[PDB]
Amino acid sequence: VFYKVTLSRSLIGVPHTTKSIVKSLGLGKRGSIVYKKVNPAIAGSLAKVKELVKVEVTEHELTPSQQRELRKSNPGFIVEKR
Amino acid sequence: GGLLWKIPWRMSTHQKTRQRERLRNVDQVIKQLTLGLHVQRCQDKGLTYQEAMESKKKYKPRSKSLRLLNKPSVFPKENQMSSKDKYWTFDKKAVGYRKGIHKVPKWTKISIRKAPKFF
RNA sequence: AGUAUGAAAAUGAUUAUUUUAUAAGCAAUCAUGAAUAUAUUAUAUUAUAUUAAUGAUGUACCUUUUGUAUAAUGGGUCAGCAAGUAAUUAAUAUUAGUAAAACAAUAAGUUAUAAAUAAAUAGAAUAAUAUAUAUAUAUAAAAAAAUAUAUAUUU
RNA sequence: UAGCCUUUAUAAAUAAUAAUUAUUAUAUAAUAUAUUAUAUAAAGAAUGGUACAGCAAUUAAUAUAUAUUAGGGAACUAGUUUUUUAAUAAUAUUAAAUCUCGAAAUAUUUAAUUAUAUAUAAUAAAGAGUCAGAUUAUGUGCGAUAAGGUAAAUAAUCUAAAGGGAAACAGCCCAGAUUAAGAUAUAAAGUUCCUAAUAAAUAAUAAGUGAAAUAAAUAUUAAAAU
RNA sequence: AAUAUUUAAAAUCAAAUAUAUAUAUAUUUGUUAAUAGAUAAUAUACGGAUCUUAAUAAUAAGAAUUAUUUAAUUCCUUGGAAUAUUAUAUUUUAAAAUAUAAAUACUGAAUAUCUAAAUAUUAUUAUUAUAAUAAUAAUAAUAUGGUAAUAGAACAUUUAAUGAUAAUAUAUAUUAGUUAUUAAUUAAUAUAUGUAUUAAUUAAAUAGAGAA
RNA sequence: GAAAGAAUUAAAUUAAUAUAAUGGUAUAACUGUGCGAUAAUUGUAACACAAACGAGUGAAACAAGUACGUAAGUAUGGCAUAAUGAACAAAUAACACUGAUUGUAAAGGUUAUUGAUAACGAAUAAAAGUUACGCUAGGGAAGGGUAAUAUAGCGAAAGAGUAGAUAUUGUAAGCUAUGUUUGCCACCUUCGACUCAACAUUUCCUCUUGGUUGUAAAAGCUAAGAAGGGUUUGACUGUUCGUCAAUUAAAAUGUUACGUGAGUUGGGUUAAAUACGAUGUGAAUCAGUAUGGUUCCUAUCUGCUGAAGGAAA
Numbered sequence A: 001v002f003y004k005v006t007l008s009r010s011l012i013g014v015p016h017t018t019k020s021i022v023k024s025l026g027l028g029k030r031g032s033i034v035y036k037k038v039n040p041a042i043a044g045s046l047a048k049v050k051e052l053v054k055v056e057v058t059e060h061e062l063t064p065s066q067q068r069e070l071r072k073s074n075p076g077f078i079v080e081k082r
Numbered sequence B: 001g002g003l004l005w006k007i008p009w010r011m012s013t014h015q016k017t018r019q020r021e022r023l024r025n026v027d028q029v030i031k032q033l034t035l036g037l038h039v040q041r042c043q044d045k046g047l048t049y050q051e052a053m054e055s056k057k058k059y060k061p062r063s064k065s066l067r068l069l070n071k072p073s074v075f076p077k078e079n080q081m082s083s084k085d086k087y088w089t090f091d092k093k094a095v096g097y098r099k100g101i102h103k104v105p106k107w108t109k110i111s112i113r114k115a116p117k118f119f
Numbered sequence C: 001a002g003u004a005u006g007a008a009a010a011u012g013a014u015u016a017u018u019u020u021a022u023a024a025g026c027a028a029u030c031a032u033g034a035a036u037a038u039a040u041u042a043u044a045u046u047a048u049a050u051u052a053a054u055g056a057u058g059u060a061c062c063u064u065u066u067g068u069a070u071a072a073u074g075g076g077u078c079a080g081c082a083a084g085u086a087a088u089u090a091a092u093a094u095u096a097g098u099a100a101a102a103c104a105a106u107a108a109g110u111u112a113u114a115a116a117u118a119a120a121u122a123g124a125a126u127a128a129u130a131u132a133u134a135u136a137u138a139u140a141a142a143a144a145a146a147u148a149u150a151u152a153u154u155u
Numbered sequence D: 001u002a003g004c005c006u007u008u009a010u011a012a013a014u015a016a017u018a019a020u021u022a023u024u025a026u027a028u029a030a031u032a033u034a035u036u037a038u039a040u041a042a043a044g045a046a047u048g049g050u051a052c053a054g055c056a057a058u059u060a061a062u063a064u065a066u067a068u069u070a071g072g073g074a075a076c077u078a079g080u081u082u083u084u085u086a087a088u089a090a091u092a093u094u095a096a097a098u099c100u101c102g103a104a105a106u107a108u109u110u111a112a113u114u115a116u117a118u119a120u121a122a123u124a125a126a127g128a129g130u131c132a133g134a135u136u137a138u139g140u141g142c143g144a145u146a147a148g149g150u151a152a153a154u155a156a157u158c159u160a161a162a163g164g165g166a167a168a169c170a171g172c173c174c175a176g177a178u179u180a181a182g183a184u185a186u187a188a189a190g191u192u193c194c195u196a197a198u199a200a201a202u203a204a205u206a207a208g209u210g211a212a213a214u215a216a217a218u219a220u221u222a223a224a225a226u
Numbered sequence E: 001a002a003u004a005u006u007u008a009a010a011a012u013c014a015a016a017u018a019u020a021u022a023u024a025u026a027u028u029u030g031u032u033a034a035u036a037g038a039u040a041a042u043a044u045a046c047g048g049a050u051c052u053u054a055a056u057a058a059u060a061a062g063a064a065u066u067a068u069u070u071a072a073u074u075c076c077u078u079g080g081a082a083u084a085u086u087a088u089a090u091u092u093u094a095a096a097a098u099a100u101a102a103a104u105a106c107u108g109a110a111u112a113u114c115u116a117a118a119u120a121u122u123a124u125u126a127u128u129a130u131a132a133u134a135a136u137a138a139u140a141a142u143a144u145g146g147u148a149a150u151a152g153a154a155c156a157u158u159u160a161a162u163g164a165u166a167a168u169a170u171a172u173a174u175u176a177g178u179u180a181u182u183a184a185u186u187a188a189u190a191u192a193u194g195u196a197u198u199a200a201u202u203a204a205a206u207a208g209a210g211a212a
Numbered sequence F: 001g002a003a004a005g006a007a008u009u010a011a012a013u014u015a016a017u018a019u020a021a022u023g024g025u026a027u028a029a030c031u032g033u034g035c036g037a038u039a040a041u042u043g044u045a046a047c048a049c050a051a052a053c054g055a056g057u058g059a060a061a062c063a064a065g066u067a068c069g070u071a072a073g074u075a076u077g078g079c080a081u082a083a084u085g086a087a088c089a090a091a092u093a094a095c096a097c098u099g100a101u102u103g104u105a106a107a108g109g110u111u112a113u114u115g116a117u118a119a120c121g122a123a124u125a126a127a128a129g130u131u132a133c134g135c136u137a138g139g140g141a142a143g144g145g146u147a148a149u150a151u152a153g154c155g156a157a158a159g160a161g162u163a164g165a166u167a168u169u170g171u172a173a174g175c176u177a178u179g180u181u182u183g184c185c186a187c188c189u190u191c192g193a194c195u196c197a198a199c200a201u202u203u204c205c206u207c208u209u210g211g212u213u214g215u216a217a218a219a220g221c222u223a224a225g226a227a228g229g230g231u232u233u234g235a236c237u238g239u240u241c242g243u244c245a246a247u248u249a250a251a252a253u254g255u256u257a258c259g260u261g262a263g264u265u266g267g268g269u270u271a272a273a274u275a276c277g278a279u280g281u282g283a284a285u286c287a288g289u290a291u292g293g294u295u296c297c298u299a300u301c302u303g304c305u306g307a308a309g310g311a312a313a
């Protein structure tokens, strides 16, 4: 099981301890998705930043490449070269 | 006070709705955190994900902060909270010992659910 | 203050195109009609260029400041000119040459090749890594603080 | 000079940052009234004395048809009672920058573990600039619980940060501009028109109260509950 | 009805959540309003217009204020189900029946994604010719606001060293094209010159001016 | 059952600690007592704390020696935190290190010790004032905020009012407004007269009205509406103000950069000259007095007063 955590809010008005926690967690920019294997340690860290973050549990995690592939929009065309 | 910080003493309807939504989101986050931990513990014992989700007896979190957050006396949910504590902080130097939450700096990020028992 | 040349700009007058006499502010940008001009592939229901219909956004520039649209500094405009350079040295770094030597070749010198110590006639494994050795304090000699020296080829 | 900034590198390198575990108690199960496992509860290893709370000791304040110690009056024949004056005791009730016997959270902070390594610490060799700061919020000192005041503490922004909101806006609420594009999610803030975007529900107001900068004691009129 | 308080969810009751559970325990929530008081000097000043509803009568308006809420309404556990609504189509007699849909409120930044482009680093490739390299191109990721400051890389100008070429050329200017463009290049036009101290690499600088 | 001992428990650190205050101290760090008088000793001190540097603090250990203790051991001054001062230049000793031709020496060094720089990181061995005759470089390293005061109002009403708190009056304390006074802050570097005034209303006069055992009348007093019109001339003083005189229906109070100096004035304030009183040794000075005494401006824009041209009628 994995927490899919997302940095919903910015870190602009945020104090330095909370910023440091966010950095440790692994979230860079706003809406930067990160999957974390569930445990007590990561849960407590997420609780510490509960108002900046959106968490949701998952069966499986996704690698960055997979996430990118999921994101990619449908090109509404099929090329045929001649 | 020649510089004009034109901030109204009370919130609009739309502001209040947004605040409520934010409060609800933090409760949801907490719920997710507890749920994931429970699922993990079920897996450790030796159940599948689906089985864990089904389980009648949900495991309560052992770490302290999480356990406190779960308690409504310490950290109440938005549905539990009073109208007043959603939209008014305690401010000892204000008249009424109360102040709009929107007047708190970084109120959109910072959480503040519980006020004192009689203030 | 040479001689030629000079569609360099500021600046003046005039003509052409275009906009402008019910509209208000860095005079621009973006949207967007219209009018005009040019176009030897405008085939057009065309393309570029010029032009304050109309709409939206838009608080000169620099300096100095916690902070300037500021009614703080400075500038009438344009043209030309106007500010981290050299010498003698020292320390770092990078590369290149040579290398336990380098530079210099007349010798002399500088740096390196040994660490110390105020200084002195002292100065690095007695059988190997420090638990050995060298120096300064101390001493009969060790120990003790400090730094340095040693595990086919010297750095 | 140190603090904060930059460049180039070094490893028998993770030492950095964040959180968890660590404790106490209960119930259940298994071994030998003890130990281990599981679950739950508890602001949960170590350090602390602010808030709060408190009146212990210290320093202060009040009351007793209460008691004692003396004094001033007063009635009968020096003894005696009452109306007392102070102190002390007793009982009850109170507060303080330099009182804390109770006592948080935040905090300081340790090991291992997990997560951050397209990431941190440390060290080495070198370059700086800066030492007039401002506002907002919270807790104070000074001031008059005055100042766009003054002095420092913590956080953020501005400083050096353009963009959206707050009519206009250095410091507030969101959010950090490599260059475009403009379909989708949106933040704060908004959705009668000016102006991009709205429909409902239940109550209350009738004063244009109010509608993004809340003006007090008090008075009048209602309304509920007892 | 009258007198007198209080304006309260601490207690109390009601409702909801969590532990054994038709009950107990613990927690959370629910208790007035209006007016007057009211007040200075360029000019009304919610930013402005303006906002308070009304039967007859609308395929139609009825806060744009205050307070508690929702995203049609009601149960069940974000989700489904039922209910009526609204719109539409069909069938039947402007109505009825059947069925399809809408229920994801929306606006909103230079936020994030998508869509492409650039540079830098990390990790994989491909092509072409310290090949463990270089150039170019892919993919995935991270980064790219900036005063004081630090670091890296370029361009214009002038001189010195080397140096083809040529009026069908070169230089300078104007106009319009081109190349992710302080620069250079193409064409046309103009004026000069029988011609670049030219391209390129080095060396250097009286080497770039809206700020004295 | 009794005596003695060992003691334990409770309380106490309120006494005492050389000395401030704080923390600590009865297991005593406090007190008494024996010995002693040594460790108020000598060389190396890691490692920490603190920390810009200079310094500061705790200190294991190694080595030499000493005192107490049966021993274990303890002592590198004081229960702790203050009790202090760099270099340079001199001075005194010890050291045996250098000895400018050699030898001595001198002189320098090492080790220990000495006195102060209190503006206390100490500029020199050694330095005060004055300028309105001044000069240069720079910095700003009435308006704005506040409303203690002031002015005005409100609530409550002690108390005056021949009687009755509320006709009229209204202690001290309470709640506000104003930005008219005197302050405070430091974002921000001229008083009066003349002339012309514009605005406010918290109204002085004029108009309307409520109350007034304290409205018989008439004069008043107090309050509500009301800013249309009006609201002074002289003597004194630079004065605004104030005192007075004579009037008036009344001689209201403000705001406007305490309106108005590119509109006038320049008496006050103000520099150069001079004198007086006081202060100073003095140059000179003054919340002093007096006589004298320096700025100018043709209007570009806005605005206002008038006057034309053009124009879409």
Ligand SMILES: [Mg+2]
Pocket (backbone or CB within 6 Å): none
């Ligand atoms: Mg017109």
Ligand SMILES: [Mg+2]
Pocket (backbone or CB within 6 Å): none
């Ligand atoms: Mg305008």
Ligand SMILES: [Mg+2]
Pocket (backbone or CB within 6 Å): none
């Ligand atoms: Mg500004």
Ligand SMILES: [Mg+2]
Pocket (backbone or CB within 6 Å): none
């Ligand atoms: Mg200017």
Ligand SMILES: [Mg+2]
Pocket (backbone or CB within 6 Å): none
């Ligand atoms: Mg101007």
Ligand SMILES: [Mg+2]
Pocket (backbone or CB within 6 Å): none
């Ligand atoms: Mg000028």
Ligand SMILES: [Mg+2]
Pocket (backbone or CB within 6 Å): none
């Ligand atoms: Mg010796």
Ligand SMILES: [Mg+2]
Pocket (backbone or CB within 6 Å): none
């Ligand atoms: Mg420095």
Ligand SMILES: [Mg+2]
Pocket (backbone or CB within 6 Å): none
């Ligand atoms: Mg670790």
Ligand SMILES: [Mg+2]
Pocket (backbone or CB within 6 Å): none
């Ligand atoms: Mg204290």
Ligand SMILES: [Mg+2]
Pocket (backbone or CB within 6 Å): none
């Ligand atoms: Mg205590």
Ligand SMILES: [Mg+2]
Pocket (backbone or CB within 6 Å): D107
């Ligand atoms: Mg603290």
Ligand SMILES: [Mg+2]
Pocket (backbone or CB within 6 Å): D131
């Ligand atoms: Mg400073």
Ligand SMILES: [Mg+2]
Pocket (backbone or CB within 6 Å): D132
């Ligand atoms: Mg400065």
Ligand SMILES: [Mg+2]
Pocket (backbone or CB within 6 Å): none
């Ligand atoms: Mg300030």
Ligand SMILES: [Mg+2]
Pocket (backbone or CB within 6 Å): none
């Ligand atoms: Mg600055």
